[PDB]
Design a protein around this ligand. Structure first.
Ligand SMILES: CN(C)Cc1cc(CNc2cc(Cl)cc(C(=O)NC(C)(C)CO)c2)ccc1O
Lengths: 156, 39
């Protein structure tokens, strides 16, 4: 089916109507999404099938048809854009300065924007258009506001 | 049985909506990939 570079919706017919369970990135013929979106299941694209190749529950990442390809990193300074793909709504660039998750193993960039769970896997871009990670693994705080890690995999 | 549908090109858009804060949060990551607020 469709192997074009770009941002995709992930849909299921297992719930009422057609439901958006999340989002991901097609790059160099590999599909990149968050583990909790697909739970590692196979994906249809046309009558095309995409089979899982790599995944890790702790990182909450999964690749299809090939190894993880996205290797760019937040610089720690600059503003970024979330390419939000909300359920039933057009793709929309939202520009923000990331904060930080401080962890016992080091610091990760964090994006503080409130979208529903089905936006999980929307890509986070630098100014060269490179994907520096995926949005949708994080924390709910105080009033019900969402803060997502900038979740990036490793290229070999 | 899940299927994918193309939603857009991956491009930086000059003059996009600008919003959100930049909190510094202490967090833990468990074996299940769950982030938790330490403080
Ligand atoms: C290792 N697991 C913990 C991964 C995991 C992740 C999710 C998705 N979580 C999520 C993602 C987004 Cl983009 C938003 C929200 C949210 O609650 N947003 C609002 C605005 C606060 C209310 O709509 C939640 C689900 C189950 C899972 O196991």
């Amino acid at each position: 089916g469709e192997t074009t570079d770009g941002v995709y919706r992930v849909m299921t017919r297992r719930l009422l109507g057609s439901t958006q369970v999340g989002v991901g990135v097609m790059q160099e013929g590999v599909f990149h999404t968050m583990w909790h979106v697909t739970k590692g299941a196979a994906l249809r694209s046309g009558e095309g099938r995409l089979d899982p190749y790599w995944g890790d529950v702790k990182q909450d990442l999964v690749s299809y048809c090939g190894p993880w390809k996205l290797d760019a990193a937040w610089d720690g300074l600059s503003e970024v854009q979330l390419l939000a793909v909300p359920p039933g709504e057009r793709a929309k660039n939202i520009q923000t300065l990331p904060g930080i998750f401080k962890t016992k193993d080091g610091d990760i960039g964090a994006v503080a924007l409130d979208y529903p769970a089905g936006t999980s896997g929307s890509p986070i871009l630098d100014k060269c258009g490179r994907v520096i990670g995926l949005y949708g693994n994080g924390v709910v705080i105080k009033n019900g506001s969402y803060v997502s890690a900038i979740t990036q995999g490793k290229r070999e | 049985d899940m299927y994918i549908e193309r939603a857009g090109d991956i491009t930086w858009e000059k003059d996009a909506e600008v919003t959100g804060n930049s909190p510094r949060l202490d967090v833990a990551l468990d074996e299940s990939g769950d982030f938790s607020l330490v403080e």
